[PDB]
Amino acid sequence: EPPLTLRERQILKLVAEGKRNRDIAELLSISLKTVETHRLNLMRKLDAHNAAELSNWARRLGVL
Amino acid sequence: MAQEPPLTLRERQILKLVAEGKRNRDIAELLSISLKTVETHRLNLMRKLDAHNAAELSNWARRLGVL
């Protein structure tokens, strides 16, 4: 349910398959630095989503 | 990586009885114990459930790298 761009979804798809940052850069014809920026943004959205989820469960369970 | 003491047989009994819509007085009569004892068991039971639940969420927070 986390909001991702299509480009982030694509990189997420490629990361989940097992591709390396250098493979992704070739596949999408973008610079390596761009890939990493995308992956950092991706990893922060995921973490934020995970934290929000766990936080909502803590409130539902009345703990922490 | 966190572990909690499970509910006792007596605590599981009260829990089952509460889940079946029994009031504290009903339970006290059924088990012939004091009302204060039933309430104390219910308080200990909820404290253990909270701790199980808090450890579960903390474990997942650790596994997922959050906070």
Write the CA distances from A8 to A14, A17, A61, integer angstroms: 10, 14, 32
Q: How far apart are CA B52 and CA B42, in angstroms?
A: 15
Give how many domains chain B has, as a whole number: 1
In a domain, B38, yes or no: yes
At residue B65, the 3 state secondary structure works out as coil
Continuous H helices in chain A: 6-17, 21-28, 32-60
Q: Give the A window 22-51 contacts with B, CB below 8 Å.
A: 47, 50-51
Cα B44–Cα B28–Cα B6 angle in degrees, nearest 5: 25
Q: What is the resolution of this structure in A?
A: 2.2
Write the CA distances from B55 to A38, A58, B35, integer angstroms: 33, 11, 30
Both tokens of A23, joined, read 């493979």
Verify whether the Cβ–Cβ distance A61 to B50 is below 8 Å. Answer: yes
CA proximity to A28, closest of B64, B32, A37:
A37
Both tokens of B22, joined, read 């029994």
In a domain, B15, yes or no: yes
Residues of A in contact with B66 (CB under 8 A): 47, 50-51, 54
CATH of the domain at A33: 1.10.10
Most distant CA pair in chain B, distance: 49
**Other CB atoms within 10 A of residue B15 CB:** 17
Write the CA distances from B38 to A36, B44, B55, B62, integer angstroms: 59, 10, 26, 36
Verify whether the Cβ–Cβ distance A54 to B65 is below 8 Å. Answer: no
Residues in chain B, how many? 67
Place of tokens 């992956």: A39
Question: Does any CB of chain A come closer than 8 Å to the CB of residue B9?
Answer: no
In a domain, B3, yes or no: no
Q: List CB contacts of A49: < 8 A, sequence separation 6 or more.
A: A1, A2
**Other CB atoms within 10 A of residue B27 CB:** 21
In a domain, B65, yes or no: no
- CB-CB contact of B22 with B11 (8 Å): no
Query: What is the enclosing helix (H) or strand (E) of A19?
Result: none
In a domain, B22, yes or no: yes
In a domain, B64, yes or no: no
Q: How far apart are CA B31 and CA A52, in angstroms?
A: 43
Cα B42–Cα B53–Cα B64 angle in degrees, nearest 5: 175
Q: Provide the residue range defining the domain that includes B46.
A: 9-59
In a domain, A26, yes or no: yes
CATH of the domain at B55: 1.10.10.10
Chain B nearest C-alpha distance from A54 (Å): 7
Both tokens of B37, joined, read 């004892």
